[PDB]
Amino acid sequence: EVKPNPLQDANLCSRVFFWWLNPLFKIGHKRRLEEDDMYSVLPEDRSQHLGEELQGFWDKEVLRAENDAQKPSLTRAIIKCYWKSYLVLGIFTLIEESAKVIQPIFLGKIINYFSVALNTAYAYATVLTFCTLILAILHHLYFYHVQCAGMRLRVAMCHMIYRKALRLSNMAMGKTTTGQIVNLLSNDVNKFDQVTVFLHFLWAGPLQAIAVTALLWMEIGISCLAGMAVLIILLPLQSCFGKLFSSLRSKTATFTDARIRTMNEVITGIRIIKMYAWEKSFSNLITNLRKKEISKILRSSCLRGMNLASFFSASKIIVFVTFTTYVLLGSVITASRVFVAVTLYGAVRLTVTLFFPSAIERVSEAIVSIRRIQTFLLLDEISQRNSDGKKMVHVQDFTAFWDKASETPTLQGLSFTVRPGELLAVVGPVGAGKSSLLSAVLGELAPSHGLVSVHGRIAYVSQQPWVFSGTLRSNILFGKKYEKERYEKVIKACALKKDLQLLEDGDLTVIGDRGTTLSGGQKARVNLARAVYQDADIYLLDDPLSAVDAEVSRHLFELCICQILHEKITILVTHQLQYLKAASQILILKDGKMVQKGTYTEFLEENRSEGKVGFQAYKNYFRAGAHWIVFIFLILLNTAAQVAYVLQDWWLSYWANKQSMLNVTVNGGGNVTEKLDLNWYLGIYSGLTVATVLFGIARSLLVFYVLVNSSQTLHNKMFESILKAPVLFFDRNPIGRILNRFSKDIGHLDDLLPLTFLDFIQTLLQVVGVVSVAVAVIPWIAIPLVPLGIIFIFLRRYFLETSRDVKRLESTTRSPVFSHLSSSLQGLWTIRAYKAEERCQELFDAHQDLHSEAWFLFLTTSRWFAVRLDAICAMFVIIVAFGSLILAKTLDAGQVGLALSYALTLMGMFQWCVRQSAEVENMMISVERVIEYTDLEKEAPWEYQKRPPPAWPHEGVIIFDNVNFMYSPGGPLVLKHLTALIKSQEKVGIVGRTGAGKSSLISALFRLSEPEGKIWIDKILTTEIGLHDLRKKMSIIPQEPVLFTGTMRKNLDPFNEHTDEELWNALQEVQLKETIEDLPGKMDTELAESGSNFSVGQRQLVCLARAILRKNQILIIDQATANVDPRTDELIQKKIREKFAHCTVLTIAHRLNTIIDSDKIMVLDSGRLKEYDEPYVLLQNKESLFYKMVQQLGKAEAAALTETAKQVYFK
């Protein structure tokens, strides 16, 4: 293994003490911990093993006729898998809680030792030493293992959810989304970590309630049945809350899915969202979903407030109810009965009225999360391949449907075959079926009739270029061996030579997710170069050529496809008729039908804070929650609860110390004796209980309310800042690193931190309370105790110096999981094309293992601290207790009267306070990561103090003066010394090779990065205007069409600013109307995520429909019809000329026949502008680059273009 792990060879004593972990603190005390410091995950805990285990049981649950008479149960598979490993921890839970019940009895026997006798109480002390050793050192290794039972289940679920995700059919990727799958891997599987802690207390709680009522019936007698009567009410009631926690979690997760789904589309769409200035729309949509989500989080947190309010006060109710129903029958005695009742209920309070109510909420949150995962694991999957002989593709009578019903077939009658040495060109209108035909050969679209046979390994060049976070080399190697001569051949043939020469830092350039840091036709050639490097047998080329320049397109077709691939099997989706002459067969599709098939001759980064969670971060978490007056009120309410609680301890003592009195001069004489005012004593004692109950309930709701409200405002600010972040931020930070904050950390601020903060706070006040009376009682003990406080703060800081780093490593090392997930979810058809699924699983497991290394340290370091605390405290408290046997009554005789009592459970409460005090500061690491993206670098303001005139671009004049541009402050100049004037209403063509900076003119115009020189729009500097006044008033069609899941209305007109009649008008003028009319809901048809329901050419047509609606005077048309077929494009060009005749129009296109009817052509060559003249004034100069580029289009094409250039010039 890469790294050791001392747990594999730790001696058992070093294991129970976690003493083997001590060397980690030696470095964490001195350094920020590093991922290379974290110990390797143990071999049995590997993500590969855990997932392959539980998938075995889940396979045996769906299969083997375990479906014969039932639906599958993922819970039965989980139980069958883990029951033996978990029931063996139940036996320790039985011994543990037996020891808790034994402790007060035998210490009570020491209180009964009171009077000394030979060699007697040393038996009880020997039981107390054995008991406290269980409670204080063995408990922690037990607790570590019940936590690892949850980690193992969590990691097993994560593996098999991703194993499923790779297999999901396109029928199923409509029923699920990246938002759900990220939510499964982040919230729903996270429940499993906490569930297995409490799960044994579903039985150890109720069983221990029955044990104490039996023991008190042997002590108090029948009145102990009133204590049990409370539990016989309370525990069935809290069992019914499980039904509400299940319901409320299922509702919450449905809104968390929708939030993460929308957030994913914001983060991926952010550049186009910015250019449209739709940021206000997504701000409202996310804040609506967050309100709906946080409502059910708030309600379920209020039930959790009742549970924790029952923990505080129900024991005091029990000791009230069992005593009021006793003094109405008998007499309260100093120490004696009341000491035994208080200590028995005090020892058992935790399990019956904290861990049991917690267990039934935690498990009811599990079972819904299991149903969420089970309903994912039962989704549809892709069937395995439909030969050692002749390699071929063969398709026969094939018909298939993307949508199972209510539709015409996507493909019908397909009957083609293609052998090595042939290229099949598939051709036809937008949406005709060309990419669906590749999806048929690729097996992503299953046949409903006919058959497909594929004898060879495929390389798929998808129509949208998939590119993943890595180096440009890694994108081309795709895990294949590096081999210099093969690599140089493909980068030459794919024209990535020169591009890898023209700066980029060369090859090995780091590329952001989705290939965002590349031009559209450059990532398209990386996407082609990957396939050619794989040296496959069958090449499925989904039009790689429409993405690239005319010269580069000829270069690719000759030196790559014809040279390298023409000996392979090739199917080429294309629109470039100039290449169809070279295809061995051509196939034309209309509406999925094979129209004709034949021959052309016959057809015609270590972002982790260094140290403490500063006081400012706590202040921000609280001031995000409520105004300070509410926290002053909360402090008063918190102390009012605790004072009322501890006054019941004192009042029973005071009552007992006055019912024990000497004035019983004759007991049979009745009121001749000073019989106690039972109505007065029960009056005040009842009052103190209702104070304890009501202030306990009130503080629990108030803490949850303000901390849930804090999670609301910290989300809101973190989303606004990210939305207003510059595009550079999204190029730099992986999608999964951002979604980690919105999924996991916000999930922690919603559910887990508000609970653990209250749990700490109310434990702190109890410790503060009892210690204070433990300084009124045996006041000398403060002198022994003062060094204990010093040791605890020293041990806390020494621990926290390491624990905070471990928790930052833990939270950080999770973000690769979600960025790899989202990258591979986009890549699925390509991953499944190469059959790289086993490789992508191996990568994903490597991310789980790296996170498991940090979680293993998180669990273990917590237990190192908790052992060191509990050993020191047990030694302290047992010395105080054992001192009674060396007559510590000589230090204070009050030790005999006011029994040691609650100090026996101070050996627990003091520990849980200091232990959970550190847990809260570990949980506050998630607050820092949310605060971090609140405080990120802002983009320039959306509106300045200056604003334009209300009709500002009255003439669409644009002037660039000396301007140069770079995408990052140290980056290369992607544009250099631009100087051009665009006249009013001037239709300007922008042309030049892939990479030449022409789409960076848009980044300068929309100021997505600051240009380094002046740009004037109608005599206003774009640098002296707010970004929404700038961006709203220029229409854009971007190079890559992005669509949002939502209605067609929501995709055309997010603000409802236009009538649906105008939307039908826009759809008619892109001639997409006939398509939308065929869809069952028309305007109300739901887009699948990223628009996947539409063909890529139709995704472009909705982007024109958007720009037609905006009606601005300035339009910027970035390659908008690249994927549109020529016969549909020529009708769109006609409509662009007619619709936007008054506009200025920066038409950026490689299709020069769209450009040639233009007033001026900008030709830019390496970011430098070098030609700006009428098209014919360039073409008549045969030295011009525009002449060369038109010449590269071919002989008759250049003649036709030169002719129509003359026609537009002679006017």
Ligand SMILES: Nc1ncnc2c1ncn2[C@@H]1O[C@H](COP(=O)(O)OP(=O)(O)OP(=O)(O)O)[C@@H](O)[C@H]1O
């Ligand atoms: N993943 C999908 N799920 C459902 N329907 C789809 C999917 N991909 C395409 N379609 C539908 O199939 C029909 C289109 O097909 P295809 O996507 O096969 O066309 P194309 O040949 O790729 O066209 P273009 O390249 O011009 O976009 C379209 O009308 C589209 O609605």
Ligand SMILES: Nc1ncnc2c1ncn2[C@@H]1O[C@H](COP(=O)(O)OP(=O)(O)OP(=O)(O)O)[C@@H](O)[C@H]1O
């Ligand atoms: N977000 C970015 N961050 C850094 N560099 C970028 C970014 N987008 C593009 N580039 C770089 O800027 C230069 C590319 O430009 P642009 O993207 O302006 O070219 P294009 O003319 O639009 O190309 P194509 O015809 O391939 O679409 C390329 O060499 C690319 O590496």
Ligand SMILES: [Mg+2]
């Ligand atoms: Mg571009």
Ligand SMILES: [Mg+2]
């Ligand atoms: Mg297509």
